Amino acid sequence: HKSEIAHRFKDLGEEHFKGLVLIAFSQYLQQCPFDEHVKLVNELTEFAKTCVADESHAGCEKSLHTLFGDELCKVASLRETYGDMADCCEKQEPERNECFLSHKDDSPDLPKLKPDPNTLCDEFKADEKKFWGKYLYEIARRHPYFYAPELLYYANKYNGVFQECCQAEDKGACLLPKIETMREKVLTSSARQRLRCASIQKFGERALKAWSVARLSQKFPKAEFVEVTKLVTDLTKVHKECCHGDLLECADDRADLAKYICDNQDTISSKLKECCDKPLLEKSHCIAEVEKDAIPENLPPLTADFAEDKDVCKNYQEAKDAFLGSFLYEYSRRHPEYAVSVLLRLAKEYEATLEECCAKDDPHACYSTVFDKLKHLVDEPQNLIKQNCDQFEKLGEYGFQNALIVRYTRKVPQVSTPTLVEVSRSLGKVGTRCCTKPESERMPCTEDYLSLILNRLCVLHEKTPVSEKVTKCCTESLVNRRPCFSALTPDETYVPKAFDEKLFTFHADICTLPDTEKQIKKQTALVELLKHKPKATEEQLKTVMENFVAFVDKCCAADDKEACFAVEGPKLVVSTQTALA
Ligand SMILES: [Au+]
Ligand SMILES: [Mg+2]
Numbered sequence: 001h002k003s004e005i006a007h008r009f010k011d012l013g014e015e016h017f018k019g020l021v022l023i024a025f026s027q028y029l030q031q032c033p034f035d036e037h038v039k040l041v042n043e044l045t046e047f048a049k050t051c052v053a054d055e056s057h058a059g060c061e062k063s064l065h066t067l068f069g070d071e072l073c074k075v076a077s078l079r080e081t082y083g084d085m086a087d088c089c090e091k092q093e094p095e096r097n098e099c100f101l102s103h104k105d106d107s108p109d110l111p112k113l114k115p116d117p118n119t120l121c122d123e124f125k126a127d128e129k130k131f132w133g134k135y136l137y138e139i140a141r142r143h144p145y146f147y148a149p150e151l152l153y154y155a156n157k158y159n160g161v162f163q164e165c166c167q168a169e170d171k172g173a174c175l176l177p178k179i180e181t182m183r184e185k186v187l188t189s190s191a192r193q194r195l196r197c198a199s200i201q202k203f204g205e206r207a208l209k210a211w212s213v214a215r216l217s218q219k220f221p222k223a224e225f226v227e228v229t230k231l232v233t234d235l236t237k238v239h240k241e242c243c244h245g246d247l248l249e250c251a252d253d254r255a256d257l258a259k260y261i262c263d264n265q266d267t268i269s270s271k272l273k274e275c276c277d278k279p280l281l282e283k284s285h286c287i288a289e290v291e292k293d294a295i296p297e298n299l300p301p302l303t304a305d306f307a308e309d310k311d312v313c314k315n316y317q318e319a320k321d322a323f324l325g326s327f328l329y330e331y332s333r334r335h336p337e338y339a340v341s342v343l344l345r346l347a348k349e350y351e352a353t354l355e356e357c358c359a360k361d362d363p364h365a366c367y368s369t370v371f372d373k374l375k376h377l378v379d380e381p382q383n384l385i386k387q388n389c390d391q392f393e394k395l396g397e398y399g400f401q402n403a404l405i406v407r408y409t410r411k412v413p414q415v416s417t418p419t420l421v422e423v424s425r426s427l428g429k430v431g432t433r434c435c436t437k438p439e440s441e442r443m444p445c446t447e448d449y450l451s452l453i454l455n456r457l458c459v460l461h462e463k464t465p466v467s468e469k470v471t472k473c474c475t476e477s478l479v480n481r482r483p484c485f486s487a488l489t490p491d492e493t494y495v496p497k498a499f500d501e502k503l504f505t506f507h508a509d510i511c512t513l514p515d516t517e518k519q520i521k522k523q524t525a526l527v528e529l530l531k532h533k534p535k536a537t538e539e540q541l542k543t544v545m546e547n548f549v550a551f552v553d554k555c556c557a558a559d560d561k562e563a564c565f566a567v568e569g570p571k572l573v574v575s576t577q578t579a580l581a
Pocket of ligand 2: 063064065246249
């Protein structure tokens with residue numbers, strides 16, 4: 001293929017090709033209408049055909065970055081709509097693309113899609129392929145780093161829901177639990193992916209390679225260290241690809257990996273037959289979430305290769321990363337039950353122990369007892385879960401969430417009120433995800449989800465920074481991010497924010513609000529309280545929360561919504577300044 005774009009079309013087929021390109025446009029230019037995007041997609045798609053006929057046509061030898069980028073620069077409303085993004089056009093590739101990426105909005109502030117059974121069913125029966133595409137649109141433009149192939153898979157599943165439910169009688173009661181389930185999976189899938197993109201973009205491939213080794217050695221402990229390095233290499237490239245935005249190349253390599261993995265399951269995992277039956281995209285999804293394989297029986301103890309062994313310092317100096325990779329693998333395959341995040345912590349620690357012990361007099365005497373500083377980092381996470389699950393069960397979801405709001409607002413009062421609300425809400429849902437799960441399954445479940453959610457915090461923060469505490473924690477480590485935040489305590493350095501009455505005014509429009517957006521208004525007010533009076537003991541906040549509730553309820557159900565929020569509102573406000581010294 002003297003022509004990359006031709007290659008892609010051949011390799012992917014029109015349907016997906018057309019999808020991935022719409023995703024890309026939707027991800028770079030996030031506030032453009034669906035229509036205007038569809039347009040560009042066909043333009044690029046027609047041309048793609050030109051090149052598959054004539055690999056030698058003018059332009060075909062151009063990179064997919066050049067090509068796609070040139071198209072972006074032709075959008076006429078682009079400076080108007082996107083600002084300093086228009087300036088990226090003045091630049092050569094690959095600086096141009098890099099500039100485009102950096103203008104991707106991680107918090108895009110677009111209407112929260114509140115789905116109507118009846119109307120959505122109409123669009124489906126009408127245009128199934130436009131409906132599918134508009135899904136692709138609306139997700140991708142809200143998740144500009146969403147793993148492109150996986151979002152294809154999700155559009156599929158979304159179609160499978162609507163194709164089935166619009167024929168049931170009570171369409172709504174059929175589909176609405178289904179769209180709700182998926183939604184969580186999609187946000188999880190988004191979160192996971194943005195953490196992959198932040199690994200590479202902020203800590204190098206090295207970082208994301210290790211994230212991999214770990215996870216894969218757990219999935220396929222029956223695989224050689226050779227195999228796993230091949231497998232990793234491949235999957236990192238896919239992820240490097242989807243992150244820098246060459247989505248077609250991404251979707252390709254990923255499918256090539258799926259093909260390879262099934263073409264080799266004999267030297268990877270017994271758990272693969274079920275996956276290696278499916279259609280293209282279903283297959284890859286199933287491989288991702290495969291059952292782990294039984295750990296091989298008679299493996300030596302670790303303590304033999306990496307502590308008892310004589311020439312460990314030596315091997316470590318010979319192939320720094322290989323040796324360390326080796327560790328990560330041997331340790332990862334043995335212990336499926338550890339969280340990935342923990343396993344990697346063990347790895348950096350091991351690295352630290354060797355790096356200190358090697359430049360010493362009697363290096364063996366020093367490193368012999370590494371598995372000692374090592375056990376010490378499997379217990380640290382273990383006690384802080386105990387508390388959380390003790391607290392979740394004793395407070396319920398929304399209640400635990402509010403406790404977290406308080407802890408976080410104290411920890412880093414600096415951070416944007418909107419961020420603290422969204423973050424604390426997600427740390428909350430972790431209770432309901434994990435504490436339910438079997439006592440010993442607990443710590444890994446929580447370690448993974450916190451990994452994502454904390455990254456979300458770092459991602460919103462890095463953009464427009466405020467807390468050196470947040471930044472220090474976000475940048476100093478990737479693995480030790482979670483401990484780093486637990487460590488933080490409130491700042492006597494924090495001068496309390498002044499009283500602003502608009503932060504604690506409640507209009508009769510609090511009863512219009514849905515349950516979710518109702519708690520948010522409430523939770524926001526909690527933050528703005530803790531921000532104004534940071535010293536206030538939960539003693540007081542207790543009756544303050546009981547008080548908003550004494551009031552929201554007394555008016556939202558009063559004879560005249562407003563005459564209440566009118567007079568009874570200011571009452572509450574004078575109240576709480578008398579309440580909080
Ligand atoms: Au636009
Ligand atoms: Mg390329």
